[PDB]
């Protein structure tokens, strides 16, 4: 009922797993207004996440809508490797990585396309992704939001918005919703 | 709906 633990990989922090997954920062040119989904809001960290969800990310959308068959796994991939997990509360299948063991048991996991750090018990339903979907960059890019009450932004999560990219240090953005 | 809303955003 519980998955076999990762055989390898380097355990990382919440901050380091964001920096070690593949992100396409060229999709957010500085001093440009771009359209992207408000992936998630993290008021405690005073940051948000935006996701292009391009036509190039179409296969991730197919997996999200459960329109693609996947091979179920009984063994957890290495720490930092990208696979898929079934969220049956929302009945979606989302890309996920395990970044570290958890001090209270389980694992610290990161949903790379939402920008959400979650707890992973170890008995979840997980799938292997095809190599082309696994290699696609993480859609969620972290942003400091200016001219913005981040607390108010929860109403725009999972919704397309327009943001003006003030700064792009190729890790996180300084952007403003317009 | 939560994350399910994203489906309606990407359909």
Numbering used by the authors:
A (entry chain A): 287 to 464
B (entry chain F): 4 to 14
What does the paper say about this structure?
Amplification of piRNA in the ping-pong cycle requires assembly of a tertiary complex scaffolded by Krimper, which simultaneously binds the N-terminal regions of Aub and Ago3. To promote generation of new piRNA, Krimper uses its two Tudor domains to bind Aub and Ago3 in opposite modification and piRNA-loading states. In addition to its self-interacting N-terminal region, Krimper contains two extended Tudor domains: eTud1(272-512) and eTud2 (562-746). Overall, our results reveal that the two Tudor domains of Krimper have distinct architectures that are responsible for the differential binding of two PIWI proteins.
Unlike eTud2, Krimper (eTud1) has an unusual binding specificity towards the unmethylated Ago3 sequence containing the (G/A)R motif. To elucidate the interaction between eTud1 and Ago3 we solved the crystal structure of eTud1 in both apo and peptide bound forms. However, the Ago3 peptide displaces the “latch helix” and adopts an α-helical structure to bind in the same cleft between the Tudor and SN-like subdomains, but with reverse directionality compared to the “latch helix”. The Ago3 peptide binds both a hydrophilic concave and a hydrophobic concave region in the cleft between the Tudor and SN-like subdomains of eTud1. However, instead of a conserved aromatic cage that interacts with sDMA in other canonical Tudor domains including eTud2, the binding of unmethylated Arg70 of Ago3 in eTud1 is provided by a mostly hydrophilic pocket composed of three non-aromatic amino acids (Asp373, Thr380, and Leu397). Arg70 forms hydrogen bonds with Asp373 and Glu402 in eTud1, supplemented by a cation-π interaction with Phe400. Notably, the side chain of Phe400 is rotated by 90° to form a stronger cation-π interaction with Arg70 when compared with the structure in the apostate. Adjacent to the hydrophilic concave region there exists a hydrophobic concave region formed by Phe400, Trp339, and Tyr446. The Ago3 peptide forms a hydrophobic contact with the hydrophobic concave region utilizing Leu73 and Leu77 that strengthens its interactions. Thus, eTud1 specifically recognizes unmodified R(A/G) motif in Ago3 using a unique hydrophilic concave and a hydrophobic concave region in the interface between the Tudor and SN-like subdomains.
